[PDB]
Design a protein around this ligand. Structure first.
Ligand SMILES: [Zn+2]
Lengths: 208, 100, 83, 94
RNA sequence: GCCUACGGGCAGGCGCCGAGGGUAGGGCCCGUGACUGGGGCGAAGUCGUAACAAGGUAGCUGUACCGGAAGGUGCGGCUGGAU
RNA sequence: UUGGAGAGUUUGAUCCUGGCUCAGGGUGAACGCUGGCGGCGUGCCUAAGACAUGCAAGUCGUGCGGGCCGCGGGGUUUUACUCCGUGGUCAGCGGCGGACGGGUGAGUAACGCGUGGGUGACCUACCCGGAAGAGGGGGACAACCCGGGGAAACUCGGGCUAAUCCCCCAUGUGGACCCGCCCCUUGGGGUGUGUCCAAAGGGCUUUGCCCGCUUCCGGAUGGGCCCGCGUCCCAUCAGCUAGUUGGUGGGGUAAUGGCCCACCAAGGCGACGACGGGUAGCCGGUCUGAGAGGAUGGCCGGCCACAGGGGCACUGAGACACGGGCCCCACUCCUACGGGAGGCAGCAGUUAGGAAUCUUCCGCAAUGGGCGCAAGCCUGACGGAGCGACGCCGCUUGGAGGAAGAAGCCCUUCGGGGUGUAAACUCCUGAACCCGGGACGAAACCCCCGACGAGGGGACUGACGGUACCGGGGUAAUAGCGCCGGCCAACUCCGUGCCAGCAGCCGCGGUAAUACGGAGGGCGCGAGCGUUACCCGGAUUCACUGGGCGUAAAGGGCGUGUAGGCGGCCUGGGGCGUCCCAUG
């Protein structure tokens, strides 16, 4: 059970916009537009001061839910990130942003993160030449993450790239829309990320 | 390298054999201070030369009696009861502290 | 009679050997004497077999009948090529 | 309820008897040569020691005498002899 | 007795040690247990009021004897005794 | 310097002391609710209980002789009887392997294991290398044939016969032992006389090559014994010891040794914990921990220990020998009641016990081992499959669009809030599933050429498995458990009424329960989630890091001094501790 249930509800739990559905979470409706209160029968109620724990918590989740990844991997990552020489936080987002499924999203070969998954599990994705269905896969720098010849004439993908002529790609990424390709340049830097989170809290959380 | 220990004759009641008191020193495996421990080896004197209160070098030898696998090397410092005395008084003390 | 053989080290369906020298009587995967090369049955890496003929020669010299299959790998390594 | 790797026991017996007769043989001969030297039969004593030494070394050839085993017996015999031949010197043969 | 080139070997016999057993006595550990001490618990009855304020004979205490009971008393010690 | 989070709880209230509790991580797990997939790993932790059945060690006819069944060919004019060759089959004699590998932890607190060393106290099958040799003579026992005992298992006796089985004799490169000397230095090495010791043959491509054989020096690997240091709890276990400690001699071994015997001496050990008792295979590592430390030691590897209980030896390079032997004991089974037959702690399985631990599967393809010149035989070592969410890891139950928002369910200050973009519905992708193709792992030994060297060429050979994996086609296609008073993320209504019940701890419940029971809602985690049990952790609450003792629990009623610990200034030697370098 890798989640998959009511979504732009979490956009609502956190109180920060969670780009979980893409188009639409741009139309007046990631719900945060016009209904910022959290879910539940008590959403509209005055909220008490959140224990240190609470914030440390809620902020872990914010990270997590964005990438939509079962705690088990998420925590695993964070573990693998503690073992690397670096800033225990920045490196976290490192692998976090290096997952095949994410890449595709940033490459624009998909409306949303979720969508990207399917694209991967269904195998519409080339990676340095061969297809790949395992999203959790880690895209090394200098890999041609692309689309299967087979998938190119797709009503979805097509309509997506059409949009790309008009949006810059992440600074650590390249792509040749014309040929529907794209390369992973180098691990993105914290300064390069946009995310409305505070790693520090996340780290701080994993020491309880 | 056949081992070599330096110690003292404390016993001289036996035949061609002498009991040698060998003191060793070392930091306590956990508390750190130098602990001083010891052991008695049953040395071996062919010509009955070695006498009580003599310090001697022990060397690992071919098994001889049950619990007598050392020959004496050379006499280090002769005449020094001082040390024996200690061993002795300690032994005597043993007589005390019981349920008889 | 010390032999020269292989040692299972891969895993379920992933055999990865280990050319070594040991007394006949020991186990396959048991305490060897001098590891002298490994060979990869499936050949996934361009480097699926190494040897160090220098030591190989020692053994045989001193007397160490090698396994049939084992030998074959030493021959490939040029363990016995006298030119 | 059978197993042909038992033939070995069927065989061991054969060697038990085999070894046995040889070993004892020696003992007897040795014990013979001995009491001769007690009396001072310089001639014959050796005549026997020799039959002894042979028998010993003969078993050593096989699996009857451990190896150095023959040796000890060769030492413990000759020595026990020479010495006795002091109670009345002059070895006849050699 | 069996075999032998008579040198000697096997069979057998006896013997020591010896697993184990018998008899006597002792020690030590487990199970079951009549009879039996007290203990702790818990809401709460009964008789009394020892302690906590000088608790109403200051208290505490080693010891000793006595007593439904708590405790009382002697002797000594202590303040962790109010005025 | 890549490394350390605390909270609840004694009060009217405070602070301190202090204990109890929780959150964290982990498990060869078990139980409950739920349960789709694959990969890799792992699965009696309890009765070392008892065990049916099958399989788990054999292999050589290029070591020797034959029996059964049968075929071909010879000597016979023919017949009976025979001579050679041969196929199957059986077992024997003889060689090698059974002392490896497989299991298990009972025992054991011990040189058992860990570590580092010793061996002038040692052996070592087959392998490798180097030197030397194989001359002559004879014998026994199975098989087989004849007979006897027994219910049976099996056994007794008589006779034949081969061999690489056995014996004798000669040669002696050499080697052994005694004695003497030279060197070394505990039984190391050189040497001299004396004495003693060798051996088998078989196959072809048969005048030479292969296998094997004998003596000796060396190698390699493997191992015996020995020593230093290390190695759990109880002192409500304090003294233990008579082969016991030592000596001489002798036995015994590969070998040192009280290991064993005789005699002699009177010793040896113990608070630096003897002896007694309790418990436990040890380690690499593993778990936790900031670390120091604590816990563990199954899977894998190394070492030890047993192979129903206890004793013992044989054969052997090696055993005191799990599927070898002899005895006694308990137990099971056959029994003509005289007497026998048995040992899964091998693989699978049976039953028992228990909370709980799998298929009487496939293969000998690969790796390894044995035996073989080889073809090849054996290999429940192994390599695979299978069963168990028992662990970990990957993966799915869909993606996008979609109302100021359906219905139902919940709440309400009745106006509305909520579940909720959730659904419906729209489009798109497409696990399952279908068809086709289809694997590495495997290249040797062998054969051929070449000198059976090097080198080169040829052939066979897969359990997994038609599986992985590629190609095409292809359906929108499982979700559950815990929790929501504080610690601790998550709040309303009703039912209830110190009842029923909850509960880790503080507690909650006597009609207004955020603490019971349901529901709406919410948090947490997801093919899983809880629970119990156990480890480390929090706990600096055994304190080396890193505690204390006026009243909190803690100074011995005082003294005396024994062992022991600890110790003043200057100079020098030694350098054991201690520090530095190199090296194994
Ligand atoms: Zn949204």
């Amino acid at each position: 059970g890798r989640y998959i249930g009511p979504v732009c509800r979490l956009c609502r739990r956190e109180g920060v916009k969670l780009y979980l559905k893409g188009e639409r979470c741009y139309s007046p409706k990631c719900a945060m537009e016009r209904r910022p209160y959290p879910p539940g029968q008590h959403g509209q109620k005055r909220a008490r001061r959140p224990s240190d724990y609470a914030v440390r918590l809620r902020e872990k989740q914010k990270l997590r839910r964005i990438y939509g990844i079962s705690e088990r991997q998420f925590r695993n990552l964070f573990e693998e990130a503690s073992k690397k020489k670096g800033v225990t936080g920045s490196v976290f987002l490192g692998l976090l942003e290096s997952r095949l499924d994410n890449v595709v999203y940033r490459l624009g070969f998909a409306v949303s993160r979720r969508q990207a998954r399917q694209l991967v599990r269904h195998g519409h994705i080339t990676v340095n030449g061969r297809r790949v269905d395992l999203p959790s896969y880690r895209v090394r720098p200098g890999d041609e993450i692309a689309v299967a010849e087979k998938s190119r004439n797709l009503e979805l993908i097509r309509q997506n790239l059409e949009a790309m002529k008009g949006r810059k790609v992440g600074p650590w990424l390249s792509l040749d829309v014309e040929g529907m390709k794209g390369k992973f340049l180098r691990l993105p830097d914290r300064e390069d990320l946009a995310l409305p989170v505070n790693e520090q809290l996340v780290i701080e959380f994993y020491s309880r | 390298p056949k081992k070599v220990l330096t110690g003292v004759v404390v016993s001289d009641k036996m035949q061609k054999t002498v009991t040698v008191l060998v003191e060793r020193q070392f930091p306590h495996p956990l508390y750190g201070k130098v602990i001083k421990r010891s052991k008695k080896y049953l040395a071996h004197d062919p010509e009955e030369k070695y006498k009580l209160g003599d310090v001697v070098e022990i060397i690992e030898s071919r098994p001889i009696s049950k619990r007598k696998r050392f020959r004496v090397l050379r006499l280090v410092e002769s005449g020094r009861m001082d040390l024996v005395e200690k061993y002795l008084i300690r032994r005597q003390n043993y007589q005390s502290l019981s349920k008889r | 009679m010390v032999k020269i053989r292989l040692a299972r080290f891969g895993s379920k369906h992933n055999p990865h050997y280990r050319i070594v020298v040991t007394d006949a009587r020991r186990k396959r995967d048991g305490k060897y004497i001098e590891k002298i090369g490994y060979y990869d049955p499936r050949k996934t890496t361009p480097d699926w077999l190494k040897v160090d003929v220098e030591r190989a020669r020692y053994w045989l010299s001193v007397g160490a009948q090698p396994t049939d299959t084992a030998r074959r790998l030493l021959r490939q390594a040029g363990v016995f090529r006298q030119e | 309820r059978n197993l042909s790797a038992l033939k070995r026991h069927r065989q061991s017996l054969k060697r038990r008897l085999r070894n046995k007769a040889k070993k004892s043989a020696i003992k007897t001969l040795s014990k013979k040569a001995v009491q001769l030297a007690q009396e001072g039969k310089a001639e014959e004593a050796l005549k026997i020691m020799r039959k002894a030494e042979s028998l010993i070394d003969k078993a050593a050839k096989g699996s009857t005498l451990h190896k150095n085993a023959a040796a000890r017996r060769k030492s413990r015999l000759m020595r026990k002899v020479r010495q006795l031949l002091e109670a009345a010197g002059a070895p006849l043969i050699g």
